[PDB]
Design a protein around this ligand. Structure first.
Ligand SMILES: NC(=O)c1cccc(-c2cc(-c3cc4cc[nH]c4nc3O[C@H]3CC[C@@H](O)CC3)on2)n1
Length: 304
């Protein structure tokens, strides 16, 4: 790709917005444009920096963060500023939590799958994200647009134990020959998480090896009460122990694109508060946070 060798005299830092998977992300203003500058925090983060610079220059997609340029002394990346913060803060963050509809849960998953499909379509070698999880998915335009970030783990299609235990494919930690179908497993977990508004494997106590043993032995998140059968089949196909039994990310884009007919209003910004910070009863099945009543209504209009 093509990056700008920006000097520190051209970038104006406003505040520290937090730390991502690696480095320190700071709010900044460069050439009448709001940018995010990820700087080196420790000398150990130089491998992840070279990798993210190498991969981010190749990518160009609306559902993936835009890398404007990079600096040399000291080395830092200058990407676009994601106004709405991370999806993890929207779902499980500090109060007040924002209200979101079933259209938002599906739109975010569609945009995530669209982004991952562009990475998996890369030539001559596909680009696997390996760390697909809500802390790495940012929101912009009133929380209506999702953008995948943190490509420090990303690699060309291996190295085992990449990501966070709750959204990690079982073959990744098993020391098996994993493929781009490991991102598909993560997507299925993210789908469950945005529909229920629950952190996957919260009941299974830490450390990560406890979740790894559970997922490795077939344990998946609880089934969702009243979840539409088309969505339930897509979600549990992504959770398959066999990665070849999981659908391709391009098939997920086609399927989610088609379901969006029954999920209108995804372009409405998140502006209402949410005091329904209530974790209901666990009895093998969980209640969805979102409501599928409007889906069933629109589906009946087309299918008898
Ligand atoms: N990490 C990256 O690769 C990357 C790449 C491109 C843009 C950005 C980015 C993150 C933020 C941000 C904005 C707000 C507003 C309220 N709260 C926020 N929290 C924010 O970020 C935190 C949560 C996500 C971590 O990755 C970073 C800390 O704005 N732009 N991050």
């Amino acid at each position: 790709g093509s990056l700008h060798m920006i000097d520190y005299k051209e970038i104006e830092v406003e505040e520290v917005v937090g730390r991502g998977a690696f480095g320190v992300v700071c709010k900044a203003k460069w050439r009448a444009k709001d940018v995010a500058i990820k700087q080196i925090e420790s000398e150990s983060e130089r491998k992840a920096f070279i990798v993210e610079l190498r991969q981010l220059s190749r990518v160009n997609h609306p559902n993936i963060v835009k890398l404007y340029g990079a600096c040399l002394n000291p080395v830092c990346l200058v990407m676009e500023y994601a106004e709405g913060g991370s999806l993890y803060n929207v779902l499980h963050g500090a109060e007040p939590l924002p209200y979101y509809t079933a259209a938002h849960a599906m739109s975010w998953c569609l945009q995530c799958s669209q982004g991952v499909a562009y990475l998996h379509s890369m030539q001559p070698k596909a680009l696997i994200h390996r760390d697909l999880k809500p802390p790495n998915l940012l929101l912009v335009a009133g929380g209506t647009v999702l953008k995948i970030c943190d490509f420090g783990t990303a690699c060309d299609i291996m190295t085992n134990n990449k990501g966070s235990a709750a959204w990690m494919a079982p073959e990744v930690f098993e020391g098996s020959n994993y493929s781009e179908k490991c991102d598909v497993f993560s997507w299925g977990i993210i789908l469950w998480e945005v529909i229920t508004r629950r952190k996957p494997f919260d009941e299974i106590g830490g450390p990560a090896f406890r979740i790894m043993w559970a997922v490795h032995n077939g344990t998946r998140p609880p089934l969702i009460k009243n979840l539409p059968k088309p969505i339930e089949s897509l979600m549990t196909r992504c959770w398959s122990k066999d990665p070849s039994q999981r659908p391709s990310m391009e098939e997920i884009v086609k399927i989610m694109t088609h379901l969006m007919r029954y999920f209108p209003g995804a372009d409405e910004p998140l502006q209402y508060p949410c005091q329904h910070s209530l974790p209901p009863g666990e009895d093998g099945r969980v209640e969805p946070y979102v409501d599928f009543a409007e889906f069933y209504r629109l589906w009946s209009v087309d299918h008898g």
